[PDB]
């Protein structure tokens, strides 16, 4: 099944939204009821798996919450994404802020490196996601040297096994090359990990890694809706 | 044929639009029939060729659908684009997000390399479109050096003959040097072509290649109007 | 007369406007008349010369049409510019998208390179306008090296005598160094010229050259107002 | 006690807000009371410490005031932030401009350097806040060279002991690597510190340090509320 | 007195506003009366010196007029800037586009160089304003090499004594290092000065110098308010 985990087809999308001030109002029970119904429908249809919903309040301006859903076919995420904005009031009073799309593929050298979500691990309580673009010369570099740099890079994170990684290619799914998501039970551990990873030779082959989206996984839509601005 | 295909004048435009939340309303039957009537007119007139309409739902924020159409004269694309915005409710309740214009020309060295749309090939079910800007030294470079880089570049895509390429100059038709479009029966094949094309010396002569637009070709206007947000 | 031309004082402005969807409507005859009446008063006063009005439909998002007008003193352009927005409906229902200002000066080495509008040449049916910023090391370069670079640059355009050039300084009149406009009877002639001009050593001393505005010169106001979105 | 401060966990957020014209109005006695009462709540709950509220009028377009508050847990900053926008009129008539989050950590080589707020010092009357991002080769630089570079960096600031420094890591809490705040009783001593600090080898390892936020600490909510635009 | 001129403390701000179409209207007589009254109160108060009001119509999109005022303390500019926005109808129907703040300081090597406003010279009828940022290596450069580079810089400007300079530090007051303003009786003399300064070695140590704001000093508020779009 290790071969099946590498040959698996899974599209992953991070859908970031911002709240429109003055749109939600103070009465939100129907919005909550209609929204939880939509997600109940996704779950029983068995096609789009919602890994988490995250309260992004306080991370950045122009972003409030985010959905992380996965599916075998991208056209499934298109329809769920479209139906959310079209047939739910929460989707009609939310603006789309940023979309991070990716597709699982095996690693170039160490095929034991698999995304946390590919392996069915339990999602972390805290998350940070952001895109990634490598240097222009990265992929044509001597494969022996690139393999050496990626080994020092994996070895530099040995002290953070509580932080689960998700590196997923994103070519042609947007303006980026990879899509990154890191889950942990505590935010301060993610911060510490990013700091340590700066001490690697791979940092000399980086072109872009913004924007960042950092938030807490909520247990149910009501926990998130009731927080948003009015 | 290959000389007349190289010599023919064809302009090509990718018209990307963004839905205005709240403008479409829930009753769209008349809006669909009117839009279909507009496209049927273009066909019978036989001046502007619509290669495809694409649902971009979930690709990026601030974009929803796209029109790809072609004409021998550019002012006929101007008139169809302006008429679409002016005389159809769909175009009235849509916002222009981005325009990618190009004009067909023969390749520098290999004159058997022609866009898939120039060769009359059936359009693919999935598409990614993005503009392109080479490095400043690309064209003044030793011509035989460029020749060699483009040949290796071409060989790196030998295993993706199901992905059909459209590389069209765009000088002075916008902010870009080339308009790129790649169509295929499956989206995953485009992601993997882009990933493979990173292993080329030509990646050292790239200045810009965003924004990306990726979507699914719809069989009819109605299929698209229905997924858009109200 | 030749040194008389190099000594002239002329300011040139490209005023690009963007239509406000929903602000115009379908009864545009009076709007067209007040607009025509305004441009008649300018020519009557004989201080501001309108070289052409241009339909940019389909060129880029957030731009619809452009005015090119010239005057000996810049304050006369400010007046015509502010009166157009203040005292004509077409100006009250349009947004300023971009302004490109310049002031004619003689060339550094070749005093017989003069802008087309300074030579009084008939304006072209198709135009492309964009700003220009040279590399930081351009002007402190050896004058003889820079002189040779400009001479080879000029020679690369020998085969496009139907494309007339306006290369005008713009220092301190905005964010750029030069303002460029290229007039031709056919758009493809402008595209082919720019592609050819890439094969010059002058491309290694370039810092900026966007945004581009390309369009067709209209015979009369009505021709433009009837294309815009209602 | 320095060992206990280094090991302290403290989250810090700068919440920059911009006023909405025509939203606040002329009568504000009730907004200042509801607002003053909100901050009174945080005081009792003893979870979120407001280090200062700053009047940013005149610093930059699209920013008017700022809140600097600290919490042991970032979830507490999330709730406080979300409650302000949701449960006070001041937060409902303002929009979020920019957010600067950080987490206090011990320094690399000199463990006696601690943020001025970790030291419990008194907030300066004037402040400048801005993010920071080092060069890509900074942390993988030979540690002795970095130690020395930061030593010179420290000696170069001996002239300004009256400006208190807060340098806090910000990895994964946004688009930046560090969050910087500099507190002083006079604004001009901050300006001179930035000017003097330009003369350091550290400046050769900088990638980004904008946007800046500079303003005056207010002694109570009323005075800030009353300078804002109606 | 020159030593007092180098030791004098003076804050300078360029406050750029943007008219709101539809917000001014036609009957602007009480508007101008109220704005002239506010500026007259400023002169009587004697703390904030208005150096000029500038008509920026036609320079750039999204900018219409500019105020240049000076004060010994920056708190007094905050007060007038806020009071203008909050209490004068003009400030209420204008948007803040950009703010340029600086603080007068002595020159590094030649203390005879002083801004034109610090010496009390009559303001010029035309102006160009823009921020400036030097290269990262500029201040750590060998002082004698920077002394020589600045001396040649100054000598390049000798052909333009009619163009008066105001180069003022802007560290910590925004996103820039210097705030530049050049006043002259003719606009074409400002363009020719910029063009000539390009022939200097200091140009190899530049990072940012945009945006520009170029306009005409008006005699009285009335002269400007009548130009604005309704
Ligand atoms: C964080 C973070 C970034 C982005 C920040 C940065 O650039 O430092 C980051 C960047 C990337 C990027 C691109 C890739 C894509 C590969 C490439 O071709 O560039 C990429 C891919 C890989 N990462 Fe990665 N990462 N990464 C971790 C976290 C981060 N990683 C942690 C933790 C571990 C260690 C734990 C684990 O293996 O599960 C780890 C290891 C790997 C391995 C396997 C290592 C091995 O071969 O031994 C592969 C493959
Ligand atoms: C994808 C993709 C990109 C953008 C990504 C990248 O930059 O790597 C991409 C980039 C460019 C760019 C610019 C140009 C413009 C020419 C230049 O001066 O740069 C450009 C133009 C050409 N491409 Fe290109 N491409 N490209 C393919 C797909 C992609 N291509 C595939 C597939 C094939 C192979 C199959 C085909 O012939 O159709 C292929 C080959 C060519 C040939 C013919 C080479 C030959 O002599 O063999 C020419 C000419
Ligand atoms: C197109 C185009 C650009 C921008 C695109 C590019 O960078 O390739 C372009 C860029 C620039 C720029 C800056 C300048 C300003 C000079 C400098 O100091 O940078 C600038 C100025 C000059 N151009 Fe220029 N151009 N340019 C033509 C078209 C383009 N030109 C064509 C055509 C001809 C030849 C036809 C004619 O003169 O009628 C031509 C010749 C000149 C001459 C005369 C040289 C001579 O022959 O000795 C001068 C001076
Ligand atoms: C202002 C300013 C900047 C941003 C501008 C710049 O780039 O110059 C600035 C930049 C940074 C940055 C990143 C860091 C993060 C460390 C690193 O890995 O880069 C960073 C961190 C440190 N700074 Fe820093 N600064 N800084 C001061 C003010 C500024 N500082 C003043 C004042 C003093 C001296 C007074 C004091 O706080 O005790 C001072 C000293 C330190 C020390 C302790 C020095 C020592 O070991 O000798 C550390 C650690
Ligand atoms: C215009 C213009 C720019 C921006 C364009 C450019 O980058 O070339 C411009 C750029 C800068 C910049 C930064 C600084 C800040 C100092 C530094 O470290 O960069 C800066 C500061 C100085 N400027 Fe400057 N300028 N500048 C003039 C106009 C311009 N200047 C004119 C005119 C004169 C001629 C003096 C006169 O008024 O009598 C002149 C001379 C000086 C002197 C005096 C040097 C001396 O000792 O001889 C100092 C100090």
Report the 3 state secondary structure along D95-147: EEEEEEEEECCCCCCCCCCCCCCCCCCCCCCEEEEEEEEECCCCCCCCHHHHH
Nearest-CA distance C206 → chain B (Å): 8
CB contact under 8 A, A58 and D82: yes
Of D78, D98, D169, the CB nearest to A61: D98
* Angle of helix C74-87 versus helix C29-45 axis, rounded to 10: 160
Determine which one of E11, E130, E176, E178 is catalytic: E130
State which H helix or E strand residue A149 sits in. helix A143-155
Structural domain span for residue B147: 1-230
- Spatial distance between the Cα atoms of C48 and A151, rounded to a whole number of angstroms: 68
Return the closest-CA partner of residue C20 out of B92, B191, D68. Answer: B92
Per-residue b or e along E30-67, where b marks 16 or more CB atoms closer than 10 Å to that residue's CB: ebbeebbebbeebeeeebbeebbbbbbbbbbebbbbbb
CB contact under 8 A, D92 and A21: yes
- Spatial distance between the Cα atoms of A32 and A221, rounded to a whole number of angstroms: 7
CB contact under 8 A, B86 and C229: yes
Residue holding tokens 């989707």?
A91
Q: How far is CA A224 from the centre of its chain?
A: 17
CA E19 to ligand 3 center in whole angstroms: 37
The token duo for E168 is 């003022």
Q: Is E139 among the catalytic positions?
A: no
Residue holding tokens 């031309």?
C5
Q: Which residue of E has its CA nearest to D21?
A: E92
E strand spans, C60-191:
65-71, 94-103, 126-134, 164-169, 178-184
Residue B78: CB atoms within 10 Å: 21
DSSP letter assigned to residue C205: G
Mutation choice for D interface testing from E19, E137, E172 by most D CBs within 10 A: E172
Per-residue b or e along A127-163, where b marks 16 or more CB atoms closer than 10 Å to that residue's CB: bbbbbbbbebebbeeeeeebeebbeeeeebeeebeeb
**Residue E124 — φ and ψ, nearest 5°?**
-85, 160
Per-residue b or e along D112-141, where b marks 16 or more CB atoms closer than 10 Å to that residue's CB: eebbbbbeeeebbbbbbbbbbbbebebbee
How many structural domains is chain E composed of? 1
Solving technique: X-ray
Q: What Å resolution does this PDB entry report? A: 2.2
- Spatial distance between the Cα atoms of C104 and C74, rounded to a whole number of angstroms: 12
State which H helix or E strand residue C85 sits in. helix C74-87
Q: Which residues contact B219 (CB under 8 A, 6 or more apart)?
A: none
CA B59 to ligand 5 center in whole angstroms: 49
Chains that touch B (3 or more CB pairs under 8 A): A, C
Alpha helices in chain D (DSSP H): 2-6, 29-45, 74-87, 89-92, 143-155, 187-197, 221-227
- Do the Cβ atoms of E134 and E209 come closer than 8 Å? no
Of A194, A210, A229, the CB nearest to D171: A194
The token duo for B196 is 């493979």
The token duo for C229 is 């979105």
Determine which one of C11, C130, C176, C178 is catalytic: C130
Task: Point out the ligand 4 atom lying closest to the alpha carbon of residue D165.
Answer: 37
- Spatial distance between the Cα atoms of E174 and E74, rounded to a whole number of angstroms: 13
**Residue A105 — φ and ψ, nearest 5°?**
-145, 155
CA C143 to ligand 3 center in whole angstroms: 16
Strand C126-134 and strand D65-71: the pairing is unpaired
* C-alpha pair distances (Å), C176 with each of C210, E100, E195: 10, 19, 11
**Pocket flag, ligand 5, residue E132 (CB < 6 Å):** yes
Task: Point out the ligand 2 atom lying closest to the alpha carbon of residue B198.
Answer: 8
Nearest-CA distance C67 → chain E (Å): 12
CB contact under 8 A, B227 and A139: no
Residue A40: CB atoms within 10 Å: 10
Give residues (CB < 6 A) around ligand 2. Answer: B 107, 109-110, 113, 132, 134, 150-151, 153-154, 157, 160, 165, 167, 178, 180, 182, 193-194, 197, 200, 202-203, 206
CB contact under 8 A, B174 and C228: no
Q: Which residues contact E199 (CB under 8 A, 6 or more apart)?
A: C139, C140, E156
State which H helix or E strand residue B184 sits in. strand B178-184
What value does the CA radius of gyration of chain B take, rounded to a whole number of Å?
18
Please choose from A6, A112, A150 the residue to mutate so as to test ligand 1's pocket, defined by most ligand atoms within 8 A of CB.
A150
Measured at the CA of A11, the angle between CA A8 and CA A13, to 5 degrees, comes to: 150
- Do the Cβ atoms of C57 and C226 come closer than 8 Å? no
- Spatial distance between the Cα atoms of B189 and A159, rounded to a whole number of angstroms: 37
């Amino acid at each position: 099944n290790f071969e099946e985990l590498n040959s698996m087809q899974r599209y992953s999308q991070f859908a970031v939204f911002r709240a429109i001030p003055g749109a939600l109002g103070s009465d939100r029970a129907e919005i909550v009821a209609q929204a939880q119904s939509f997600f109940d429908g996704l779950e029983t249809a068995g096609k789009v798996e919602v890994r988490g919903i995250y309260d992004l309040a306080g991370c950045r301006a122009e972003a409030d919450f985010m959905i992380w859903w996965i599916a075998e076919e991208f056209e499934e995420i298109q329809a769920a994404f479209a139906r959310f904005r079209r047939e739910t009031v929460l989707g009609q009073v939310s603006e789309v802020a940023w979309l991070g799309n990716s597709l699982h593929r095996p690693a170039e050298f160490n095929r034991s490196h698999l995304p946390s979500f590919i392996m069915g691990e339990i999602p972390g309580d805290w998350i940070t996601v952001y895109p990634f673009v490598r240097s222009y010369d990265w992929y044509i570099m001597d494969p022996q040297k690139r393999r050496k740099i990626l080994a020092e890079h994996g070895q530099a994170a040995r002290d953070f096994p509580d932080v689960r990684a998700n590196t997923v290619p994103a070519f042609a799914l947007g303006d980026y090359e990879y899509m990154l998501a890191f889950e942990a039970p505590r935010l301060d551990r993610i911060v510490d990990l990013m700091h340590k990873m700066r001490y690697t030779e791979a940092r000399l082959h980086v072109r872009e890694e913004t924007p960042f989206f950092t938030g807490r996984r909520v247990s149910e839509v009501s926990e998130l809706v009731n927080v948003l601005p009015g």
